[PDB]
């Protein structure tokens, strides 16, 4: 996996030394090319994980997330063009350095072969995200945003540190393959449930579940437009990879211990959907819908079902794409209006004919309608949860009952109706935006046509 | 006065000073160049030749292989009537019964 | 009144973030507000000497 990591690491001096205005161009081009190299990794041999070295390995679970991150890096890269055109050249290169280091640490996490290295790079993501959120933020509460995000993630992570060093001392190794192959039944001992809690709560923290979901709403709102999509897109899914890999040792104790959090997700995905009918900010709207989708993926994980795993694996990719998709639109409207109020500007279709079209398929993908991979990822979870506990379909039906009520509500109160008469600075949509949502939505259906790749590693 | 500040600057739009621009930068020629590069691999070979790459990837989990190699097993076992499946995958005989 | 405000913006933020931050509040000013008199510091050394010596009986 040096093939894709080394280009990213060595790309850094290019941005840090190139000319004051070619840095955007060169970073964009080389990001598209290392993403090109990345999609060659979609190959997965039989059931064997694609091994590369003693420290780096990948599989069908990893590959979609890897090529995801490589595909995004250009997206916030050229989304940053508007918001960073007026700041100093050295700060521009530093911002690009932050993004590149973030992507590097992501592809390091996802290819990790041994647990504690995955953990080191798992916490290595906060530093770039914290820097991006705090420095290049816009409003005042961004400082408390960084505090909440950093402290929440750490307070989750440290128990996982103690648990992992304990696993290494006891079992003998933390390599993924061996602990899957040398797995043993985690008994119902009173130390074992705290073992499980330490190995689970860390990932649950950066997978906002009901109750412990304040950092995302209070950080994504005023995070920089480029950063916000990165938080909402990937770092909620590295935790999902964490569950995907750590649940191989947490059985069979997961059978009955998962129940408190399990239901805390289903009712949770209703409340964060129920909260989602009433938001004064569009960014908070997308954040709460995202929280609902991650509660869905959480209950997908905790059942331990191959169909649940497939629905999850599809759901991380689908939700990340759609969430960043909507966040781009929120950025565009805010930047034109220099505010983030919900009902400030309705009826934008009367001014930007193609922008509300983008809004339309963005919400439609948020709807999870067939045959989009959002629907198929949800549907596998529907089937798994039904086979789990019969009635679960009632609560999850309430979720596929609220999702569109808020998604299309956002359309009717942003794009449909008529423009508010006071605002008059809304110019024609620049090709940068509509181009970026084009590169966002078209591959969303392209890989929908080929769902095997993102379907899951249990295929 | 309470502080010596520069007031909030007006957020210029590129089209107003420079029509035919692209919301990409101030100098038009690199506006064009950024257009070409993003409308390159972004929508070009990464998006399309990449689509063929993922679509025309080698055997996925040997499913295309596992398809062909299983009708032969089916035929072999229906020849003697033993069905396409079995109750046990691992063989009872080689594994001992405890007590 | 139940999903928003009272639950998200009142309750959950009160329990984990604000209550723990208030604990650190109340225990940072009772920990780091000593006047600077050598006496009371030295009697803090004093009672610690016996608590280490006989009360806990570290040596035993």
């Amino acid at each position: 996996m040096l093939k894709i990591i080394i280009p990213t690491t060595m790309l850094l001096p290019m941005t840090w030394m190139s000319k004051h205005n070619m840095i955007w161009i060169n970073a964009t081009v080389h990001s598209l090319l290392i993403s090109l190299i990345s999609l060659s990794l979609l190959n997965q041999l039989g059931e064997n994980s694609l091994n590369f070295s003693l420290t780096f390995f990948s599989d069908s679970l990893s590959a979609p997330l890897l090529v995801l991150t490589t595909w995004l890096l250009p997206l916030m890269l050229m989304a940053s063009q508007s918001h960073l055109s007026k700041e100093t050249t050295t700060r521009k290169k530093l911002y690009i350095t932050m993004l590149i280091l973030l992507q590097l640490f992501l592809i390091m996490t996802f290819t990790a072969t041994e647990l504690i290295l995955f953990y080191i790079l798992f916490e290595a993501t906060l530093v770039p995200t914290l820097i991006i959120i705090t420095r290049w933020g816009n409003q005042t509460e961004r400082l408390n945003a960084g505090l909440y995000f950093l402290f929440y993630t750490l307070a989750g992570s440290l128990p996982l540190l103690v648990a992992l060093v304990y696993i290494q001392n006891t079992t003998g190794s933390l390599n993924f393959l061996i602990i899957h192959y040398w797995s043993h039944p985690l008994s119902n001992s009173w130390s074992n449930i705290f073992m499980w809690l330490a190995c689970i709560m860390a990932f649950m923290v950066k997978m906002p579940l009901y109750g412990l979901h304040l950092w995302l709403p209070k950080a994504h709102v005023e995070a920089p437009i480029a950063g916000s999509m990165v938080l909402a897109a990937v770092l909620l899914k590295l935790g999902g990879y964490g569950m995907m890999r750590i649940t191989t040792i947490l059985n069979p104790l997961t059978n009955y211990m998962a129940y408190p959090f399990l239901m805390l997700s289903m009712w949770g995905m209703i409340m964060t959907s129920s909260i989602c009918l009433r938001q004064t900010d569009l960014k908070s709207l997308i954040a709460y819908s995202s929280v609902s989708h991650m509660a869905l993926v959480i209950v997908a994980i905790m059942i331990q079902t191959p169909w649940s795993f497939m629905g999850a694996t599809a759901l991380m990719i689908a939700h990340g794409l759609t969430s960043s998709m909507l966040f781009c639109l929120a950025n565009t409207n805010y930047e034109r209006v220099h505010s983030r109020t919900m009902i400030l500007a309705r009826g934008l279709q009367t001014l930007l004919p193609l922008m509300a079209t983008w809004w339309l398929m963005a919400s439609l993908t948020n709807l999870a309608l067939p045959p989009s991979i959002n629907l198929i990822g949800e549907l596998f979870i529907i089937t798994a949860s039904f086979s789990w506990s019969n009635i679960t379909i009632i609560l999850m039906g309430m979720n596929m009952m609220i999702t569109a009520l808020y998604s299309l509500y956002m359309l009717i109160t942003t794009q449909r109706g008529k423009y508010t008469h006071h605002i008059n600075n809304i110019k024609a949509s620049f090709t940068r935006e509509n181009a970026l949502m084009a590169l966002h939505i078209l591959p969303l259906l392209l890989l929908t046509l080929n769902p095997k790749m993102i379907l899951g590693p249990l295929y | 006065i309470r502080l010596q500040e520069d007031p909030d600057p007006e957020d210029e739009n590129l089209y107003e000073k420079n029509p035919d621009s692209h919301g990409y930068d101030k100098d038009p020629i690199v506006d064009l160049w950024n257009m070409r590069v993003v409308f390159f691999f972004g929508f070009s070979i990464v998006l399309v030749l990449g689509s063929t790459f993922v679509a025309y990837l080698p055997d996925y989990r040997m499913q295309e292989w596992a398809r062909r190699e299983a009708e032969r097993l089916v035929k072999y076992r229906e020849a003697n009537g033993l069905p396409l499946m079995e109750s046990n995958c691992f063989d009872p005989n080689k594994i001992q019964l405890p007590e | 009144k139940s999903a928003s405000s009272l639950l998200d913006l009142i309750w959950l933020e009160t329990i984990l973030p604000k209550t723990t931050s208030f604990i650190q509040m109340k225990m940072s000013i009772m920990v780091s507000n000593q006047k600077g008199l050598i006496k009371l510091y030295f009697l803090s050394f004093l009672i610690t000497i016996m608590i280490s010596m006989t009360l806990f009986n570290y040596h035993e």
Binding site: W136, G137, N138, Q139, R142 | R2, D8 | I29, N33
Partner: peptide, 19 residues
């Protein structure tokens, strides 16, 4: 532009001890 700390935002620390 973004928001930078006002004079009051620096003032709240001030005061020897800020809590």
């Amino acid at each position: 532009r973004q928001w930078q700390p006002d004079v009051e935002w620096a003032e709240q620390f001030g005061g020897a001890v800020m809590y």
